[PDB]
Design a protein around this nucleic acid. Structure first.
Lengths: 88, 90, 88, 100, 220, 112, 117, 183
RNA sequence: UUGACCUCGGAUCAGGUAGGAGGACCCGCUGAACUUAAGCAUAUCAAUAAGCGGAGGAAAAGAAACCAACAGGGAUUGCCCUAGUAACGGCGAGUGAAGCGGCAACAGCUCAAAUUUGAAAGCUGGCUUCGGCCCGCGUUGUAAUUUGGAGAGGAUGCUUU
RNA sequence: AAGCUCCUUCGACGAGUCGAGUAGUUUGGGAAUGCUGCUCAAAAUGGGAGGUAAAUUUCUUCUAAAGCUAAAUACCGGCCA
């Protein structure tokens, strides 16, 4: 029993995509979510994990819908910032 | 002649004796999910018990045939969950 | 290998140990016409009469399990259709 | 004659979904606003959000076509049509395999 | 229009993958791998060897398939592959020798089931004539038509063909994007590794005149 | 027996026109390597060099097709937002993960 | 290869001379029954199938119908005079047919047949 | 010829008339007991080819047996089970043979041909005195009937290397350690 | 009213049959675990031990839907060899045949599928002066002929009881 | 009554059984090694098993779903020696 991070196990292209992967040991990129909307998205996912099991289908659906709205607002703000950068 | 009286007696005796004494949801799931289509449904509906007389036959014999004409089709836990949720009342 | 003169052997009576006699052909066809058709045979008959030869072949293969058996059964059903047309 | 490579009306793949998503369980895309990608590569939104009153009414009296299955194409649950329900009833009873 | 290709000019191509009555489990696994990889194809098994090749042709006509991939197992030990352009197209026989299927845990590669591959053809497939024919048939077989909507849209795997001695070698790799250091490709093997010795090329659908005979084939 | 003329006429009957002038890479989706790769493989038996030569040829074809796909604008990068069916099972992915973890644990445990 | 109970499944050969003398007494008893007749029936000369033993020949099961007819011995009467008959075998070669015909002719020339009752 | 026509009917047993007859007879068999006596067979052609004779001492018994799994499958066939039940029912008779006669969604139906060994017509008939001999006691119990041979794999070829001469006997022969005097 | 045919039952009617025992060897069903792999889970132990049913002096198997690629062999069975080969396998532990060849012994047959149709020629029982009289079975098929390296039917001329 | 020879005459050969899909069990044996259970369900120039790259499934060898049968073989049991 040893930590997978220490173990040099390469990522594998399962159903969950690997996407683009950083070269090993050289300058992992930094992405900021300093935006309040991104804060709210990740915080809402954290609170979803905190709540966990719920006995109401309606409550589960509304939780999912709220955090989906979180991603939607984050994506809209990212698109607006991309448009602003293209203008500049 | 017509046998109506004797059939009446047989049915009355059968009623007196009676007084004295998942598959559908699986098929619905297979139709809903892109697994089996209409042509496949009729193809599977052409079974060994197809063209079973059911209207002009006596009730007791029809009940016996209904007891012993059940084909065993595979079932799924999803279908079991669906039927449990359907049968769950208020 | 070795050079030996081959002989001509007598025809074994075990050849054709199935059926090819006209009497058995008569009996088989008469039993066909007295007994009728199975549900799937009648389904394929309807398909062939409507003209869906491909659909009939596929259904026969699905019911039988072998391409050769499907082709053969389509053949008997086709001559039955032709004979019924001639009889009418 | 040269074979024209066309789906027939009886083919298994005669109608295939636009979602392009395979046999994956629906546990994925629950948190994502879209359902998969199309041929061109554009994601497919959820159709709409169900009303609380409508959901409560459905739970109290599930519709005739209710199956408890989420549509692979759209976020709304998949519901069987009246013709499909009649087909299932005919298959279950065995009284008429083919009409007319 | 139900040819199920949404494209400007359609590449109507279809593959019927057929197996024989005595195929080994390794060969069935290979059949499953190519069936997963080929999304315009139909799987079918247990063709009687006592039947006829033009009977395979009516089978392909029944399935409306313009290409057929036939797996003939001899001795239950040796694979024979037939690539045929169904209606009146020339057919190629190869012998498959060395077999490695996707289910082995030493590949460490995975891709989309049906996504379009990068067809990586060797140069001999570009100079040599019977290799011209093999390249054309292989392109038509693994062509994965343009607007065919039973395919996923993002390219992530490479199907590479390469002859070394006189034998076609097939490789399947996954493209992995890693950003460049102040993004390029690493290929990681996925699956079917099967070694091909060409044997014959006939002009007809499954018969017809013989045009190439590989006069270096030593049979098991 | 090698009837080159007949091979050419049969390929003429078969041929689907493949011209970069006329037909897009999005259609034909084929890359022809300039090298024969039999020079790249010195000896057939040497598995490492054979795999490296196939790696090189496949990589060159992949880069060429990638450049053509940018030239055409067709999407090429499968996003992290996407989940779809794999050609092999997530169970197989879990098993290969287990094997890799076991090998690594054995190695650094031997070091320990 | 002693994973199992060879202790319970070991069987010895201390009765070898006993079985030998029993077999000798059995063939002597057969001779006493068929006192003037030979103990074993005449058998044809056949060839070993496999390539490793082609050049060698051995004894068969019984003579072929064509060989019997050529030698002039009836099918129904040959077993009564002690000739094994095999209906399954076929000649397929004039060499083997002639060899078996010569063997049967030698048997006829060396055989004395008694006149029924 | 009538037996040939009956054989053709049994070949096309899924036809309309045969399906109707098996339906009616299945209802009758369900109404009767699990085991019952037939003086005359339901399929005379099949009985005749299996060996039934129009003699005093030959009887048919019709038996219904539960079908389905025992996921452990019961290695003895339902035919063998029916024959064994017939043996315990009438231990006096000898099981000549058996043949499937009908089937249902719960029961499968067999007819067994049985021979009386103590009747002197059977003793006299030299084609049946073999089953009159005492070696054939409870052939159904020892697996000596057709179903027994089929389940024991008593066939020739490389496909039946392990069972052509008896599974347990072959195992013993292969696992005996033979030691000669002069080793 | 009467008499059949079919089916289902009763009789302390007449004649027989099945238990149980034994189980060394034999034919089936069912079926473990310890152990080994210096841990253990697949595997092994083992298609074994226990349990259940069924015979004989032997049982079983047995006259190819076989072996084979031969210049062919020719029911089954047992020994030697094939051979620790092929083949399979946490490819570790390990498992593990068969053809051929030398032998011992050697034996082949009965049916269903045919119309005796110019003659049910077949068989059970009880009644006997024991020689031949009935009753019943049976045509929804008992005798004779025939069983596919065959045969039938005529003609034909030899040879056997 | 029987064996033959000849022929301008005939020559019937075993079905929920093969086979396909599938679960269990078993084997050295996914051409599923054999078997059992479930669904479907055959053919008559037929069917089975093999040979073969040789150019199309050519060629070889047998007839499954009825049955009998002594001898060579095992034997801690029975009657003895």
């Amino acid at each position: 029993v040893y930590s997978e991070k220490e173990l040099g196990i390469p990522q594998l292209n399962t159903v969950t995509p690997v996407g683009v992967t950083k070269p090993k040991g050289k300058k992992k990129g930094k992405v900021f979510v300093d935006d309040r909307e991104s804060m709210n998205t990740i915080l809402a996912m954290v609170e979803a994990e905190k709540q966990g099991q719920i006995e109401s289908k309606i409550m589960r659906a509304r939780q999912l819908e709220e955090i989906r709205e979180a991603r939607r607002i984050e994506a809209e703000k990212k698109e607006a910032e991309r448009k602003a950068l293209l203008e500049n | 002649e017509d046998g109506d009286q004797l059939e009446r007696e047989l049915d009355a005796m059968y009623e007196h004796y009676k007084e004295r004494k998942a598959e559908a949801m699986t098929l619905a799931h297979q139709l809903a999910t892109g697994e089996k289509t209409k042509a496949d449904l009729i193809d599977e509906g052409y079974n060994k018990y197809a063209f079973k007389q059911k209207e002009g036959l006596p009730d007791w014999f029809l009940e016996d045939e209904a007891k012993h004409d059940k084909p065993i089709k595979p079932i799924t836990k999803e279908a079991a969950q669906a039927i449990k949720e359907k049968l769950r009342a208020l | 290998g070795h050079k030996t003169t081959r002989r001509v052997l007598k025809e074994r009576p075990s050849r054709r140990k199935g059926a090819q006699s006209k009497r058995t052909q008569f009996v088989r066809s008469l039993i066909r016409e007295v007994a009728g058709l199975a549900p799937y045979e009648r389904r394929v008959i309807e398909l062939l009469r409507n003209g869906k030869d491909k659909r009939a072949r596929k259904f026969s293969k699905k019911k039988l399990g072998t391409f050769g058996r499907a082709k053969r059964k389509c053949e008997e059903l086709q001559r039955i259709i032709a004979e019924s047309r001639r009889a009418h | 004659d040269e074979i024209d490579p066309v789906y027939d009306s009886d083919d298994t793949d005669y109608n295939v979904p636009v979602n392009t998503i395979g046999n994956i369980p629906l546990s994925f895309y629950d948190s994502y606003p879209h359902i998969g990608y199309d041929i061109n590569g554009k994601k497919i939104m959820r159709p709409a959000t169900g009303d609380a009153l409508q959901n409560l009414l459905d739970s109290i009296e599930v519709p005739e076509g209710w199956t408890g299955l989420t549509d692979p194409n759209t976020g709304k649950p998949l519901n069987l049509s009246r013709d499909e329900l009649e087909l299932i009833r005919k298959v279950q009873q065995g009284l008429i395999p083919d009409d007319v | 229009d139900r040819s199920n290709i949404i494209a400007e000019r359609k590449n109507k191509q279809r593959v019927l993958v057929l197996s024989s009555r005595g195929v080994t489990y390794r060969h069935r696994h290979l059949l499953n791998d190519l069936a997963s990889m080929l999304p315009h194809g139909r799987k079918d098994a247990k063709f009687d060897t006592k039947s006829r090749l033009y009977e395979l042709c009516e089978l392909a006509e029944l399935y409306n398939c313009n290409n057929v991939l036939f797996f003939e197992a001899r001795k239950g030990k040796d694979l024979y592959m037939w690539f045929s352009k169904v209606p009146n197209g020339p057919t190629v026989k190869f012998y498959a020798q060395n077999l490695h299927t996707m289910e082995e845990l030493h590949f460490q590669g995975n891709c989309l089931k049906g996504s379009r591959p990068i067809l990586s053809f060797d140069a001999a497939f570009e100079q040599e004539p019977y290799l011209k024919v093999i390249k054309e048939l292989f392109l038509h077989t693994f062509g994965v038509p343009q607007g065919h909507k039973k395919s996923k849209p993002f390219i992530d795997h490479v199907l590479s063909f390469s002859v070394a001695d006189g034998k076609i070698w097939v490789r399947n790799y996954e493209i992995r994007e890693v950003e460049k250091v102040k993004t390029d490709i690493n290929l990681i093997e996925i699956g079917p590794r099967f070694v091909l010795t060409p044997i014959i090329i006939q002009e007809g659908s499954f018969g017809g005149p013989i045009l190439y005979e590989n006069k270096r084939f030593i049979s098991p | 027996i090698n009837n080159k003329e007949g091979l050419l006429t049969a390929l003429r009957r078969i041929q689907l026109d493949i011209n970069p002038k006329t037909t897009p890479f999005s259609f034909h989706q084929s890359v022809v390597a300039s090298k024969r790769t039999e020079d790249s493989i010195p000896q057939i038996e040497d598995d490492l060099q054979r795999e490296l030569a196939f790696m090189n040829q496949a990589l060159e074809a992949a880069r060429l097709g990638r450049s053509l796909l940018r030239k055409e604008g067709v999407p090429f990068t499968r996003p992290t937002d996407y989940f779809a069916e794999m050609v092999r099972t997530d169970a197989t992915m879990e098993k290969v993960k287990q094997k890799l973890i076991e090998e690594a644990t054995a190695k650094k445990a031997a070091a320990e | 290869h002693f994973r199992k109970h060879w202790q319970r499944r070991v069987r010895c050969h201390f009765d070898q001379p006993g079985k030998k003398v029993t077999r000798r007494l059995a063939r002597r008893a057969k001779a006493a029954a068929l006192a003037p007749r030979p103990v074993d029936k005449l058998r044809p000369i056949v060839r070993c199938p496999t390539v490793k033993y082609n050049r060698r020949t051995r004894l068969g099961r019984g003579f072929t119908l064509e060989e019997l007819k050529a030698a002039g011995i009836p099918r129904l009467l040959a077993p009564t005079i002690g000739i094994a008959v095999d209906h399954r075998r076929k000649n397929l070669s004039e060499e083997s047919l002639a060899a078996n015909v010569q063997r049967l002719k030698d048997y006829k020339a060396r055989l004395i047949l008694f006149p029924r009752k | 010829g009538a037996l040939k026509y009956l054989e053709e009917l049994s070949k096309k047993k899924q036809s309309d008339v045969v399906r109707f007859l098996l339906r009616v007879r299945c209802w009758e068999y369900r109404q009767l007991n699990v085991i019952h006596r037939a003086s005359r067979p339901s399929r005379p052609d099949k009985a005749r080819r299996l060996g039934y004779k129009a003699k005093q001492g030959y009887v048919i018994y019709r038996v219904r047996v539960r079908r389905g799994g025992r996921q452990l499958k019961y290695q003895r066939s339902l035919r063998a089970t029916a024959e064994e039940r017939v043996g315990r029912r009438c231990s006096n008779l000898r099981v000549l043979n058996s043949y499937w006669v009908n089937q249902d969604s719960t029961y499968k139906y067999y007819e067994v041909i049985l021979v009386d060994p103590n009747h002197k017509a059977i003793r006299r008939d030299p084609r049946i005195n073999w089953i009159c001999n005492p070696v054939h006691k409870h052939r159904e119990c020892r697996g000596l009937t057709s179903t027994g041979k089929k389940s024991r794999g008593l066939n020739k070829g490389h496909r039946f290397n392990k069972t052509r001469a008896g599974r347990r006997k072959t195992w013993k022969r292969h696992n005996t350690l033979s030691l000669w005097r002069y080793r």
